[PDB]
Structures are given as C-alpha cells and as structure tokens.
C-alpha cells in the first residue's frame, strides 16, 4: 500500500514523493488518508486556481505542523494521484499561514526518470515565472475559504530544503 | 487499503462513499473487488450513456441483494475512481430490476468539503432535471445487454435513505 | 492490494491483466512496484509516441528476464492505471532487445466484459494496422534513450502465447 | 467559409461531411448556422447520452424536411467541430418523429484518409454493436424533451443512401 | 463569418454571445480578430487561474473603452471557442483597471437551450459562490503582469446590463 | 476568414502562424483548405506518434514545393486548430522525402504573448531534447505509409529561417 513506500533511496538527496494533486487539474483537493492509504477528497477548492506543479508529500516524515513534508514536483505532463515519483529537492518556499511557519519544498524528477531537469541544481535555477506562479498560488488559493490566509516569506536553497527533509524524517521515528 | 475505509464518521447522517465510476466518464463500468481492494473492469457498457453523477458504495454495508449499498454523488467536477468522499444522504431511487427491489441512494458532499449543497436537505431539494436524468439513466443503460431490464418506482426521502444505510450496516456485521 | 490479484480465473485461457499504462496516454511510463503495490513513475519517455493499446502484466508470473509477463490489451476506451482486466490471450510479439529474447502478449477483453472481440480467436484475427502499430511502437519508442534498441522477430499464435503464460506461472512458484 | 465547401468530390460516391458534433463529446448539440456559417449552440442535451459517432451534414443538399442531409461518421478518434471529412456513404437509418419522417445517413472515412474502413461497403458490414447503439441513441436522446419522440423504422443499404444524396443535391439547386 | 453574426434576436433581452475562452480551460487567452474574424492568441496567462465561466462578446456593439461588450456565460459544460450562444443578460460586474473603468456582463443560456437557468432572473439570483469566484478571478488574474491592476467595484442588476447593451449597440452604428 | 490573415506584423522578424495540428493531440492530420479556408481532415495517422509541437503555416507564402511555409511552434499548452499565433522564427529543419527536398521552420511565441521564450534567439538555444524529438518524429511518422520516406538532413539557424520566409513571401505575390 502507499503507507509502505520509503521516504527515499538515499535521503535527503534522493527521495520519493507521493503525488496527491496533479498539475493543472480540476480544483479538487485530494489527500491520502494516513490510516487507510486511500485517496480522500479533502475539499472542493473555492477559488478558480490550479496547482502549477504536481503536489504531494514524503512518506515517513513528520513536519512541525503534524503532517509529512509536502512537495511540489514540476513534470512535463501531469501525474496520476497516488503515483510515486523519484525526485531531488532543489529548494523551499517559506510562508506563514494562520499557524506560524509553513515550508513547501520544490523537488524535480530524478535523472533516471528524465534528463530535462539535470541543470536545475538549486533554487535560483528554477524558471522565475514558475517560482512566481507558485508563490502567487499559495498566497491566493484560500482567499475565499477564510479564517484562512497565507503570507509568503520567500525562497530558500537546496541545503535548507534538505535540512527540512532530514529533521522531519528524524522527527517521525521518534514523535 | 480501500477495504478498511469506515462506513462513515457518524452513520447514517455522515458517511463515506467509495467512488467507482466518475460522472461523465467513458462507458467503462469499474467495480472494487471485495477480496483484493483493486479496481476491476466489470464490463464495457453497451449503450451510449454516461453516469450523470459519480457512482460508488458505502463500505461495511450489505444490502438485500448481496452487495454494499450503492450511492450517487453529484460534485462540481468528476472524482477519481478509488477516491473516498464524505457525504450526507438526501434521498433514494427505488426501482425493480429482474431480481425484485433495488434502491440507489443520492448523497451530496458534506459541508466540510464544499458549501454548494448546504441547502439540499432532502429529495425534493435536488434539481428536477438531475433527478429525471438519473431515473432515465437507470431505465435505459442496460437496454442492449438484455435478459436485463430496470423499472423505476420513484423517489424516497432522506429518512428512507438513512433507514437503508442503517439496515444494511447492521446486516453486514452479522450475515 | 494489487499484489494479491490472481493471475487468472483459469490460466492460461482466462487471465487478469494489471494495467500500468493506458492506451493513448501522455508519455509517462508507470510501473507497479512489486514491494509496495503502488504505481511508480518509471520514466518520462523521450520519443513522441504513445502505447497503441493498454499495457500491463499478469501477477504471479516470472518471465525469463526477471519480471512478470507483460501484455497489451486493446479496448474501446483507455483504462485507468491500476485497474484489472479479465482477458484472453490471442498472440505474442517476439522481439530481441539488448538482453536477448523478449515476448509481449496480446490479450483481448473476455466475453463477460464485452462481445466486441468474440471473433478474435488468434493472432491472424487482429487488425493488420494494429499489429503494424504495435511492432512499429516497440521498434522505435527507445530510439532516443539509447544503449537501448529493440528488434522485432514477428508474431506468434495463441498457443505460443498460452505456453509463455504457463511457463512463467510455473517459473514463479518455484524461482 | 464552411458555406463554400463542396458537397463532394464525386457525388454520390465521394462526399464531404461538415462535422457539427464529435463522437463521445459533452452533451452539447452544436449546429452550423446557414446565414453566417458559425457554430451555434442549438441546445444542451437533457439526457445522459453521447453521439456514438461524429455527426454532421453534406453542404449544398436539401432534404424534404428542409435542411441538409445529415450523416453519422465513425472514426477512430473524435473530430473537431467545424471540420470537413471526406467519406463514402454505406447506409441509411430511417425513422419517424413528432414532425414526421426522417432519415440519417452513415458514411465511413474515405480510403485516402484511412484504410481501416475499406472492408465496409454496405450497411450489413458495419459492426452490429455500432448499429444497435446508433438506433438506441436516436430512440432515446430526446426522451426528456416534452412533446418530442423518435421511432426507428429500420436500416437501408448504400444504394438507398446514394439516392437520398442525389435527390437532395438536385433539390438544393432546382427550387 | 463570425463577423456577420447578429447582436441578438431581440436586444437587449435576447442576445448572442460569441465565445472566445471556455470555462475551466488551459490558461490561453484567445480573442476574435476584428478584421479577419479568426481566433488569435492574445496571450498565455501567467497566473495559475482559469475563467470560471465561458467568456466572450456581443457582435456589433462598441463600449466606451472601444471594443465589444464582454459577457461571462455559465453553462453546464464548457463551450467551444468560436461558438455562438443564445443568452439572457442578468447582471453586470463593474471594475476599474490601469486603463480606467470597465464592466463585464453576466448572461445565462436562453430557455430554448436549457431550462436550468430559468429561475435566474437577476444578479442576486446567481449562486453566491460563482459571483465570489468571478470577482476574485478579475482581481487577481493579471497580478503577475507588470503595470496591470484590477479593482472590483461591485455588481449591478439585469436592468443595468440591458442599458449597457442598448447603449453600446447604438454606439456601434451611430459613430 | 483564415484566408485573410496576414503573413505577419513585420516579416520576417514578426509573423503569424495559423495552427493546423495541436501539440500532443490525437493522430488526426488536419489541414486548412486553400479555397474554402475550412479545416479539412487530410488523414488519420497510422503510426502511434503525436506532433511534439503545434504545427501550421504562414499565410500568403509559397514554398518551392508549392504550398505555404510550415512552422512548428512550441507553447506551454496545446493550441486550438484554426487559431492564429504571433511568433518569432529561430530555426529550420531541412529534410528530403520521396517527393524531394523539404524544410520545416521552428518559431517561438512572440514576447507580447509570453516572456518564457525570450532567451531563445536561435536554433542552438532550443532545448536539446525538443530538437531530437522533432527530428525523430519527422523521420518516423510516415513509416507505415507505403511509398513515403523522410530523411532528416540537419538544422539551420534563425537567419536561414528568415530568408526562407522572405523568399516564400515574395514568391507568393510575384508569380
């Protein structure tokens, strides 16, 4: 089942992301239920917006806000919800939402899946438009479902992304 | 796995439907296999028709005809086969097919997923065109795969829908 | 889970294929991970080509190259990745790739799912264009991802297809 | 302009069909406007049905119900609305509705487009399932339209289809 | 030609809208060219947003910003670009941008197309969520366009929508 | 009419391309008819291949093979058939086929449409994988067409692309 996928072949450089929401999909927010392993409908998003990249998480990871680290994965074609993709982390989006800090990593497909991202080694290598899209998406997608709000503090590098992997992996085995 | 999703948070008011066939899909009839939990192709439907709502079942339920209670779930966008959606029952379609009574519930997305169905509290609140579509679909979708035939006896209320949940949940733990 | 689907109701005449790649899809090569049962992204294909039929495998089978027997399944509409389809084998495509012989079966939907393939009993009953498409796909889809190359030796009959099922089923229980 | 497209390269054996509704599309009934040549929305279909083949008309023809002769065209992938396809007539579906008698031709793609239809020379060569679905569609797609009924009378051969096209071509000029 | 389509069957109560951008489509902003009547790509949208309704214009109208009056049209399925829809105005969205004042009409499908919109007679009858999404879209779709801003001023009723159409129709001739 | 669209705002640096075949579409080869300006089906492709970019032509140009100059245009989402895109030439693909020599231009979206292509000034700036896929497509898409072959000769720069457009524009008038 999806609950027994490994975090990565070699964390934090070489990880698996479990995809929950494909890039450019209808505005249905899916989430994998941690008891069943099944895809749950979490909500029907109320803004006319879409995730600019595939969205999911690293299994066996516990972030400070109680859930596994979440990750955005650019691909040339949208992936199936429930699929698992081998990636390498390249950067991190720092925000605050109503409960203090949130981070969302960006990870690119690993070279065994594709060579089109070989030259993206860090956060400054990502296209500027795509970074600006992601930031704009996270600042507005909950505008109409409020008591909710997000603010974007800015981009960090591959080493900050890796640190967040490692600390949340470690945090999982214990609490 | 899909075999360990709960029937509901609070049956019969607050249930989970396991989606097998999305609204407006190609005419492939999928079914979740109760031994494996996997999506099986049940048949390629022979009429040029589509399910007017997402179609699936409540887990841990046994109806009088040997299978879990089946349910139609209107959403603003079609859902993935295998996904699980939180809903509240609002009515029931009564038919007879070659083996006596069949019921199919209608349940709407629960308010935590969407507010667009808050005002639908019972069977008379459903749009008339959608009810007429569903009835027409169930009367004709098997026209070309005969020895099969369906006749529609008519709509019942939210309390009859809830009763069918409860009796089939109870019926499951025992036989 | 997908790891506990049976090879077939009655091997080798009556088998289940686990679908990994739908017909006519984006050029994402998915594969079911044999440890987890989950759909993995195997690679993003580099040619502008698509599988001309749905593609997958028979569970509980071990071919000579270390993986389960793979199968192409024509359907009137593309199937979901992860779905299971009841089929009957009708022929086999023989190739050599860099590691000696490869076979890929063709199996058609079983008559309980559809009647549109009833008249296809063997390999000469398949439309010639579809056979020529499949051969052309397998000869070129890896042209740009080389150190890889495929050559097509030609079509065999339903009895050779069945033999390959049986030998790989037997080969699985033991090694 | 679509108003200037010919009736065919060689009537009645070699014709063009202007496509109004794609096979397997959403339940929106499009029509070419005669004055402007633009694609108009004639209506949203109220049954959960789709056209089993692409649908349109032959330009410069006038049937006795006072519009261009309509044709149904099977193709391996749906066509774009407003597109023009070269075809051969193979049959006619005769029916009666609440306005009187009607007739629908069936034409396959010309050999210059595709060889896949070269063995279909007449109405009994069409796959039995397609004929059954086309008939069932015409008899039920207007069922939720108050006042509108369709009764299918039977099929007629290629020769009957050719005569309708000649008759209706002549009648478009001479009047 | 789309340049020859009428403004409406009976202005301002019964109009035609030429559709430029489908609801829920890829983020490509199409426009009909005035000279040629062809569909041009005006631009690729840079936010991750989609139009919440089909968008287009009324032909033979000229607003005080010097183009045809635009309309937003909700429909149950997205429409084709270049297609013409018969509609009734029910409201107007007033806004200001970096070029000055602007106004966007909202029109529903005429009763001849669909009865589903017959209870919507005016701007307060639109579903509350659709109005909120349309406003939010206009206020944010140009956020990554340097120099371009939108401020939404409020809604106005059906009567205001009719006056804009008359005013702009007259102004298209008399000039 | 598409027959009246200009060759470009400022040839040869700023051109319009009329789109005939979308990137990543079904294997239907569309062409604009010269007389009518309608979209015709030229053929159903017989290989399992798709165009790796949108394909079309520049109006009011005539190449030495006696039709308009064709162009391949990469865009972030597929375009509609019949739509017109503003572009800049950056390269040419030279080949020979069974009718003789041929050439295919590559043009990216103009800066007014999208800034994403502003760093692509010439043929060596295109992503290496796209060039490889375009070449491989042209060399294999007609492989199952009896009598038809394609041999790719090499690329040429933006300057060569501009000269072809001038040459073919002049040749469209003066004749």
Curated annotation (Swiss-Prot), chains A, B, C, D, E, F:
EC number(s) recorded for this UniProt protein: 3.6.1.1
Record keyword Magnesium present: yes
Disulfide topology: none
Top-level taxonomic group: Bacteria
Pfam families linked: Pyrophosphatase (PF00719)
GO terms for MF: inorganic diphosphate phosphatase activity; inorganic triphosphate phosphatase activity; magnesium ion binding; zinc ion binding
GO biological process, one term: phosphate-containing compound metabolic process
Tagged with keyword Phosphoprotein: no
Binding sites annotated in the UniProt record for Mg(2+) 1: 65, 70, 102
GO CC annotations on file: cytosol; membrane
Binding residues annotated for Mg(2+) 2, in chain numbering: 70
Binding site for substrate: 29, 43, 55, 141
SUPFAM superfamilies: Inorganic pyrophosphatase
Enzyme class: hydrolase
Keywords: Cytoplasm, Hydrolase, Magnesium, Metal-binding
Cofactor(s) needed for function: Mg(2+)
CDD domains documented for this protein: pyrophosphatase (cd00412)
Location relative to the cell: Cytoplasm
Subunit structure and binding partners: Homohexamer.
HAMAP family: Inorganic_PPase (MF_00209)
Protein's recorded name: Inorganic pyrophosphatase
Organism of derivation: Escherichia coli (strain K12)
Gene of this entry: ppa
């Amino acid at each position: 089942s999806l609950l027994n996928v490994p975090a990565g072949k070699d964390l934090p450089e070489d990880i698996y992301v479990v995809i929950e929401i494909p890039a450019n999909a209808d505005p249905i927010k899916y989430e994998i239920d941690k008891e069943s392993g099944a895809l749950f409908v979490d909500r029907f998003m109320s803004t006319a917006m879409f995730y600019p990249c595939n969205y999911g998480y690293i299994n066996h990871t516990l972030s400070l806000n109680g859930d596994p680290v979440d990750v955005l994965v650019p691909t040339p074609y949208p992936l199936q919800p429930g699929s698992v993709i081998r990636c390498r982390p390249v950067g991190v989006l720092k925000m605050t939402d109503e409960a203090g800090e949130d981070a969302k990593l960006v990870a690119v497909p690993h070279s065994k899946l594709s060579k089109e991202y070989d030259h993206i080694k860090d956060v400054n290598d990502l296209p500027e438009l795509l970074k600006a899209q992601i930031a704009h998406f996270f600042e507005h997608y909950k505008d109409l479902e409020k008591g909710k709000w997000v603010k974007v503090e800015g981009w960090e590098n591959a080493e900050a992304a890796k640190a967040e992997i490692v600390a949340s992996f470690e945090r999982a085995k214990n609490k």
